[PDB]
């Protein structure tokens, strides 16, 4: 039984104190969908070059938007597709962008009337197409914030979906998550996707700012457009769950020593373990609170976290055999 | 192939009003942001304002917010700048410019057009051809001049043979003298070309509908 | 309103030399900075956007960089066509203010001015004023000094001089100088002389004429 591990560390400077970051891989290159707001707001498409992020486009200037929007990126081997959708301030309006080089995006605008997610919360994320019987689908998924009462499984996690790139969003996709608690409330739900495998990553707890616990749910087919999803555990003593990814059909799972995130652990198949200790040379405490995986392929993946200024620590993680 | 053209420039008395237009062609005018900027004489570029294709988003420099107002007609492919209550600071060459795709930068500027704010009124130039010295010494080359004198205000256009003559021209910046500009121009050609071929300086002053031509001929009897 | 301070202002250099202007903003302006060039007699042309991106059709010699407060613009091998006015602009927020500009002129081999003197036009004397004109074309370096002689005496008043920008074609400057006077003041004197002094010759260049020639 072979195991090969290697760890690299690279730093990146960003002149933009992005309110929220959204990395994705296209070609071999790394990209970020930055959001800057504090009157005027920017959605930069930055790209990693040598040692620093390089802004390439301000999608948001095409606007006709009012304020901060939900962002939905979808990356294929062929072309990136980026949607800028208004959140509720009643049928959805979005701006579609697409590029087959990562540099020159083409503009478009779409409207989905009577849209399936009419009373659901949404959060921005990056994603990959979901193959289904020779039909790949982009999913915009929304979760009900918190359920006060009556037991019902209808739309605890609802998704509307498109198989024509981003152009039309007709299809409905139902998720049956067989779980409930009274004061529990979900946040930041995103679909992890790998081949045909659908999964969801979200935070649980009472209403936002006091979120703590991570939850992850694998999904399996019931119909062509209906999934049943059961919770998958990842708890470890004196460690807080952080993020989940796959390498070679195996899980790689990060944790922190506790909620202050002084150190981060990477766990390969819950067998091998790596410790990332952030070196500190600033008056600010160094930590890995934002750390997230960015899959490259079945062997390589990144672990990224920012710090005091726009200093993106980036661990290049190799693990194979 | 993108093309812009400014119009409406000229003199205006202080405290007055003036309309400036910019026609655009060769590209989808309703697909791009538009902007105004201006150049005071001897000074750097000053950004003025910008407007999005739907006219929903219009922005100005703080100094001009209550003076100028920008607008556009997508049906006419035209940008508009309405100026009023001008002072001496506004005397400038105005450019209209397009923003680039996904950038807040001026990827294409127009030529611009002049605006002058002064209490003085218009004056047409005199045009005096400058033939060489009467006892001319022919060399490999001869040089002819053209003297534009006493016009107001800027600008003024000067070409040779209606632009047929290109190399060897030297057109100097106008010098001001007590509310009256003066300009001059030189041209140099082979001794075999002149006086064997006609050479004329064409002068145009839009401010008072003035158009004069002056043919250069050697000093002597006629 | 953000302010954009540009250093330096004047640059005189030979061809084949590298150059690097810098632009410092009063506040953080992220990566949104553009660099423009306007050659003399030309409207500004875009060259750099988002601090470090080429615009389409921009020759490779031009590059840009910098972070946060400060940025740099760089030419690797300056050419005679690059004589121009370059300046930066911040795109992060309105107003999108410009910098103060940076003139760029080129060295070349020095040249003696070509001088010609022109007596007042036949049409002009009708108006009661006479204009003596003197042209000094195609000369390097920058500085040159002209004196006006009227029957051997230096003349103070009435001179009006004007200089062209450096020519992109030959990296050469050009100058005109004109003395106007009352036609009666022209009428009492005979000889007139344009005199010129420049580093290319120790002796002044002289060109002259008398009233009846
Ligand atoms: C300057 O122009 C304004 C407006 O002209 C109109 O707006 C332009 C964009 C153009 O498309 C024109 O064809 C339009 O008709 C003039 O202001 C108008 O003036 C009339 C009387 O002069 C008045 O009834 C209108 O309400 C005015 N409209 C506005 C918006 O103010 C103005 O007179 C022009 N001034 C000069 C000196 O040309």
Numbering used by the authors:
A (entry chain A): 31 to 68, 73 to 123, 129 to 360
B (entry chain H): 19 to 240
C (entry chain L): 21 to 233
Question: What does the paper behind this entry write?
Answer:
We then purified the PfCyRPA/c12 complex, analyzed it by limited proteolysis, and crystallized it. Actinase E treatment was not necessary to crystallize the PfCyRPA/c12 complex, however. We determined the crystal structure of the PfCyRPA/c12 complex at a resolution of 4.0 Å by molecular replacement using the individual high-resolution structures of c12 and PfCyRPA as search models. Despite the limited resolution, novel molecular features were visible in the electron density maps of the complex, providing confidence in the relative orientation of PfCyRPA and c12. The epitope recognized by mAb c12 is a surface composed of blade two and part of blade 3 of PfCyRPA. The most frequent amino acid dimorphism of PfCyRPA at position 339 is thus located outside the epitope recognized by mAb c12, consistent with the observation that mAb c12 binds to P. falciparum independent of the PfCyRPA variant they express. mAb c12 buries a total surface area of 950 Å2 on PfCyRPA with the major contributor being the light chain, which buries 520 Å2, while the heavy chain buries only 430 Å2. Each side-chain of light chain CDR1 residues 50-RND-52 can form a hydrogen bond with the side-chains of PfCyRPA residues Asp66, Asn45, and Tyr78, respectively. A particularly large contribution to complex stability may stem from a salt bridge between PfCyRPA residue Asp66 and CDR1 residue Arg50, which by mutagenesis was found to be true (see below), a further confirmation that the PfCyRPA/c12 complex structure is correct. Tyr120 of heavy chain CDR3 can engage in two hydrogen bonds with the side-chains of PfCyRPA residues Asp92 in blade two and Tyr144 in blade 3, thus establishing a mini-network that bridges blades 2 and 3. Similarly, the epitope conformation in PfCyRPA is very similar in the unbound and complexed form.
